[PDB]
Design a protein around this motif. Structure first.
Motif, short mmCIF file in Angstrom:
data_model
loop_
_atom_site.label_atom_id
_atom_site.label_comp_id
_atom_site.label_asym_id
_atom_site.label_seq_id
_atom_site.Cartn_x
_atom_site.Cartn_y
_atom_site.Cartn_z
N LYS A 1 -3.15 -4.63 -2.25
CA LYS A 1 -3.62 -5.85 -1.55
C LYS A 1 -5.10 -6.01 -1.90
O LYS A 1 -5.45 -7.05 -2.42
CB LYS A 1 -3.38 -5.68 -0.05
CG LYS A 1 -3.33 -6.96 0.75
CD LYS A 1 -2.62 -6.76 2.08
CE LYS A 1 -1.13 -6.92 1.99
NZ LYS A 1 -0.56 -7.53 3.22
N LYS A 2 -5.88 -4.97 -1.64
CA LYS A 2 -7.35 -5.00 -1.86
C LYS A 2 -7.65 -4.50 -3.27
O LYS A 2 -8.82 -4.60 -3.67
CB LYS A 2 -8.09 -4.14 -0.83
CG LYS A 2 -8.03 -4.67 0.58
CD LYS A 2 -8.88 -3.81 1.51
CE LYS A 2 -8.90 -4.27 2.95
NZ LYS A 2 -9.25 -3.16 3.87
N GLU B 1 -13.22 3.36 -0.12
CA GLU B 1 -12.31 2.58 -1.01
C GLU B 1 -12.89 2.58 -2.41
O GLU B 1 -14.07 2.23 -2.55
CB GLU B 1 -12.20 1.15 -0.49
CG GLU B 1 -11.57 1.05 0.89
CD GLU B 1 -11.23 -0.37 1.32
OE1 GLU B 1 -11.75 -1.34 0.74
OE2 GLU B 1 -10.44 -0.52 2.22
N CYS C 1 0.88 -1.19 0.00
CA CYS C 1 0.00 0.00 0.00
C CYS C 1 0.91 1.22 0.00
O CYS C 1 1.75 1.32 0.88
CB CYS C 1 -0.96 0.03 1.18
SG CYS C 1 -2.23 1.35 1.08
N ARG D 1 3.43 0.36 3.01
CA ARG D 1 3.05 -0.79 3.86
C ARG D 1 3.19 -2.04 3.01
O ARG D 1 2.35 -2.26 2.14
CB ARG D 1 1.61 -0.63 4.33
CG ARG D 1 1.37 -0.93 5.81
CD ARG D 1 0.00 -0.43 6.24
NE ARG D 1 -0.64 0.39 5.23
CZ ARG D 1 -1.94 0.62 5.13
NH1 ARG D 1 -2.81 0.07 5.97
NH2 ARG D 1 -2.43 1.37 4.16
N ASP E 1 -3.85 0.89 -2.63
CA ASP E 1 -3.84 -0.41 -1.92
C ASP E 1 -3.90 -1.51 -2.97
O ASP E 1 -4.94 -1.72 -3.57
CB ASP E 1 -5.02 -0.48 -0.97
CG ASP E 1 -5.12 -1.73 -0.12
OD1 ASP E 1 -4.55 -2.76 -0.51
OD2 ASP E 1 -5.80 -1.64 0.92
N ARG F 1 -7.86 4.08 -1.50
CA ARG F 1 -8.53 4.50 -0.24
C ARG F 1 -8.29 5.99 -0.08
O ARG F 1 -7.15 6.39 0.27
CB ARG F 1 -7.93 3.80 0.97
CG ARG F 1 -8.24 2.33 1.08
CD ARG F 1 -7.88 1.73 2.42
NE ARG F 1 -6.56 2.15 2.81
CZ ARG F 1 -5.96 1.87 3.97
NH1 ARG F 1 -6.56 1.14 4.89
NH2 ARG F 1 -4.76 2.37 4.21
N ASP G 1 0.78 4.54 1.20
CA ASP G 1 -0.08 5.28 2.15
C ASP G 1 0.43 6.72 2.24
O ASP G 1 1.46 6.93 2.86
CB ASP G 1 -0.07 4.57 3.50
CG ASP G 1 -0.95 5.17 4.56
OD1 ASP G 1 -1.41 6.31 4.37
OD2 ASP G 1 -1.11 4.52 5.55
N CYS H 1 -4.43 6.23 -0.30
CA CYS H 1 -3.59 5.01 -0.21
C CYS H 1 -3.86 4.20 -1.47
O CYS H 1 -5.02 3.90 -1.74
CB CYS H 1 -3.89 4.19 1.03
SG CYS H 1 -3.94 5.15 2.56
#
Lengths: 110, 121, 124, 126, 120, 124
Positions: free
Chosen positions: F104-105, F114, E96, E105, F102, F109, E98, F100
């Motif tokens: 992973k997802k 999201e 991520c 992350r 992301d 975000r 961030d 963010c």
């Protein structure tokens, strides 16, 4: 010999051939093609391909295929294709190109 | 043997040498200089789109071609073309014959075979 | 509008530009092709690729027969890729034949013979 | 005489004049113009705003200056350029205006009746 | 953080990694490859600006934070950045970016983006 | 093949390319025309010295309203002639809204909300 050159003839015209074992393919400059009246033999592929021309190297004649380019780096680059096709030895002891059993001496440059 | 390579050693290290009669000068890549630990051995040296200028010169490195040993001088480049380019300087300095009938480099009276396409990419 | 002379090289008619400021006589590659002198050349060349202009030497003709007026002259010249002028008659040949550029009579006096400078119609 | 040069004087100042039948126009370098005190004589007549890439074009035109060649004096018009290649280029304009002969037999310029000798390599720099 | 950089290590050597979600592929400069002694590892794969492709590192050991990661990248003669951390590696380790906390992350661990001082 | 998000600018649906490596947000002129934003612009540009692409700046939109998911955001961006992407969402806006990215997802975000990255099918 400072760089390796040989006297050859293509279509009867005297030519200084640059011997390059590091070149995969033999080339002749367009200007050299023009000087040797080989333009009439050309292809639609780099200016074109000469499918066959007569090389006179020493006392023997050789059938040859090469590409014509616009670059005048050398008039004719005798590459590894032809070096191996006629099973040559680049002899820097005797300073000769040994083709069949015949020795052609390395050169006459400025 | 679609291009000419030879197995040689410089300062004991196995190398694949590209044999080029069209090159005035012998070159080695920086990576091959690193692998032969010759970086510490260098010289100063080209005035003011390619050929990758110069890293340095190796004044002398010992070459093993066949069972015989040879003194050599060459230039190190950042150019990655080949690890070692055996040029006309060395070809004539040791009076080599590039024999494409027997497919060997004949250096003194000894014959070193050109490498098969398998030994290369 | 500048100095030209009618000459022949190896039998071919040429308009020669007379230039006392040029150290060397030159012919264009196209003129060399027209005069079938490509096979007649040397290994004469200009080093390896520094200077930023003109173009460079294609090669040298060691000796060719020049017909100026009634008389024939042996000459050497260089061939270039630049087509600016077909033939530049330079100071080399101007002094080699001890020519006079006579702008009183508007003639090139080569020996005792006089070759007239060309009128603007004799040029394009 | 690696090229053809003549000794002349322009506005009283000694100069080496390069004799070129292949130049349409007589030129003097800006440096030569400054050394001959001809700068206060200049014009606005120039080479515009469409340009080339190398010749530093035209500083201005001298409509008339006195040349001394041999014992005689000649009125002259010429262009000043920034290029210091040669100090003074005696072109076809002036060559024909005074009906000069470039005699390479005697190695002289014959200009009105007098003969002016072409300069030896000594009279010219390294 | 005038652009996004991270401190990483490749074959033990500290590097500033440029984080770019817009780059499909991770690249390292030849200069960086030399400074990390990854020269003896190169496939020498090429293409038939940024001076194109020198060769590919099929696997090199990256230390990002306290964890080690196996990585594949290309070496180029372009000095644009020493190391470009691209979308390939960004997604491979499910990172991520961030910008709330200003951290990358990677696993559950957070690596801080570098201050403008740590860069030119 | 890359990171895209569905957004709206001044009411118009857009596919935004998410690039953390770009300092500045840009929109193509064609997208500016589709969003009726051409009359809304400035005299902003990049001087005289450049490269061989990017097609340089047309001008700046000082404020346009972005809808990312359910929330609305004020934005500034530059318009270019380059159709590389219709809209490049750069690090300026990425950090301005503390987004963010992301992976992973596979979402952006932006606040607590999201926004999913688009499938390869939703791209052309």
């Amino acid at each position: 010999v400072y760089m390796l050159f040989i006297d050859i003839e293509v279509n009867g015209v005297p030519i200084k051939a640059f011997v390059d074992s590091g070149a995969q393919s033999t080339f002749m400059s367009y200007a050299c093609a023009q000087k040797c009246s080989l333009l009439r033999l050309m292809d639609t592929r780099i200016v074109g391909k000469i499918h066959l021309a007569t090389l006179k190297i020493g006392q023997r004649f050789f059938p040859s295929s090469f590409t014509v380019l616009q670059d005048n780096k050398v008039e004719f680059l005798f590459g590894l294709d032809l070096l191996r096709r006629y099973q040559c030895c680049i002899d820097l002891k005797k300073s000769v190109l040994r083709i069949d059993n015949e020795e052609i001496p390395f050169l006459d440059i400025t």
